[PDB]
């Protein structure tokens, strides 16, 4: 595979950091009074 390092970089980020960050910020947005 060409640029074979890309899955091992992007899959943890897309699979863990991206949902962890959207859950954190969605939680902040849905639990704010203003």
């Amino acid at each position: 595979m060409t640029a074979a390092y890309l899955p091992s970089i992007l899959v943890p980020i897309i699979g863990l950091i991206f949902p962890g960050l959207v859950m954190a910020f969605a939680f902040i947005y849905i639990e704010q009074d203003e």
Partner: protein, 732 residues
Amino acid sequence: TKFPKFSQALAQDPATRRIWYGLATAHDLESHDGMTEENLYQKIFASHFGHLAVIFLWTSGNLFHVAWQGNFEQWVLNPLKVKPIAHAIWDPHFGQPAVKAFTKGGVSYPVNIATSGVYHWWYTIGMRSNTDLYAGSLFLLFLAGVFLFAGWLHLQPKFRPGLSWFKNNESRLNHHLSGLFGFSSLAWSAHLIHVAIPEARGQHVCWDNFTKVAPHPAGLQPFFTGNWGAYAASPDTTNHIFGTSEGAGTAILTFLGGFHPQTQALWLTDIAHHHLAIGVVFIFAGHMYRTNWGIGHSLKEILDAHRPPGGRLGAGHKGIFETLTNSLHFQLGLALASLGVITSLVAQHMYALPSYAFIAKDYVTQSALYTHHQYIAGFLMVGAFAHGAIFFVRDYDPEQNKNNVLARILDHKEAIISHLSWVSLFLGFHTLGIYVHNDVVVAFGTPEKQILVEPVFAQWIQASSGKALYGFDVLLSSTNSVAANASSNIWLPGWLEAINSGKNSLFLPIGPGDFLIHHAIALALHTTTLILVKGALDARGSKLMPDKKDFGYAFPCDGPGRGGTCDISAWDAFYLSMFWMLNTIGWVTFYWHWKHITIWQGNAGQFNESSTYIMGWLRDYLWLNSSPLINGYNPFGMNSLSVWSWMFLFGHLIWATGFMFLISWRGYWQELIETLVWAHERTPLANLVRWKDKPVALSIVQARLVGLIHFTAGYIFTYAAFVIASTTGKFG
């Protein structure tokens, strides 16, 4: 306290119900607070640009992942032996046997094998290398950006269209028929003639050379002379090797009928002439309506004048024009019903008349494509009836529709609903009675007492198309007949060659098992139609709730009085018809898949004898074909069917979890949740942490939706794992 910014009633709910209901109502812009008609149409326009951009990003992603990680060039060399690759696997939970088991496809990394058929589609239309797959993915990324920008642009104050634009029926119909349907069909005819057909004949044509390479040797000279038939001369020979110059002809628009003998697919020159003729017809259709120059028709005038003088339709279609124009739900219902019929035609005509090269030898791709498009068809058909119910509740005005076809439908809704009830019961009693008949009498060792009805009507239709298998001489089947003699010079030889070889799926032979399953399909259709029609026609009112329209489309009930009113809303008739849609698509795809795996093995007699009782369906289809699937892993190892073997169990779990939401109802759960609220407040070190939203049990309608989603998802995942793994494991 501000998530549902579109709903102040939900943004002030102090429970967890606010989050769920805010997520589930987000796209129902008509009900959002302070919604005008201007803003409703403009948000729908922009989100239609966003949906188009999502479709282009999905297509570019499939092209990119195949270009990057696929084996397209190797598959192109040897398409019947190589298994096409979808994308690579990078999963840090895999064991090393799992990594080895998924390293098929001729590559050095674990990988998924594609069941979508995109390889056969891209090969047939011209793609030959990875670099033009990558070129197509960058074009779709650009188009996605263009349509995201256009969606943003038409929300800007100067570029926001008025309602007078959004309701111009005649200009939109002229442009969508002549440009969106017709001209793009003409342009696809151009692509086939200029690129797909030349590269089907060994000659590369791309953007670098397509202005200096003529599609035809004569070249646009017969077209400008009326010598159009010079473009059909010298078609591809029956010795042609697709993709190469050997056996290739020079025709571009010839009509031959039948299949290319080696690809088992329709001729590319038949397809190019099809899209040229469709393009011409649709461009002509797109000049019907009057826009700015005084020729054409007013849609209002046509609808108003079509009242039969005998008076049997009442006022006819007077006032239908305004009713359809003002109701987006009526438009959605018509669009979804039309789309549902087409995606069912796509499923039926793509297995019987395949257009892509070397597909229909990919039994997994053929099975997945049929199943996929029939499930899409069932969802679109349910949605059409659901949005017709929403139309009657929300958008229908009985006073602008006095004595219409619509009002007279509602005027005899009990005649309609009771005759669907009768035909559903009529079909059900006797189809199930014959099935249980044959079951009981085969069980007692007497299969010759079965009731086996020959499907003579469909066999006669097959013979009318030229099938010489049942000895009916009517129409095309007769050597001498006006029908047979008329088509003799054009498509009839190739069509008879295609329909009288038992090597394809064109008008497959049928018997008593096909008769019984057709009646079961009819019972399933009429009963799903019953539930949906009853929901649409009783949506406005009934005898239990004569004022049902004051409560909306989706409300839980009217309480325990008057005997009890659970599932009384029109939404609950959508909910109930979803089970029957799943059941009917189950019967349809079970029938298609069993008939095809028995034919592909060479054992059609196994379907012929076992399909007439239900134990034949249970042991010879579900039980017999389960074994490669459930052995994808076992205490002795695992193979590449291990993922479907997991999805299979996964599907059984979600489906059963749906039962919990469908059988057990709210009061039990609210009382449990109150004991959990008490325990959290009384537990030390834990009452330091407090909820912002009071935990409540799910609502009645929400629980119905969640159980329906779990049921449906389990249904899809279980059958997808079965239909793909059993066909893969058997290869036949």
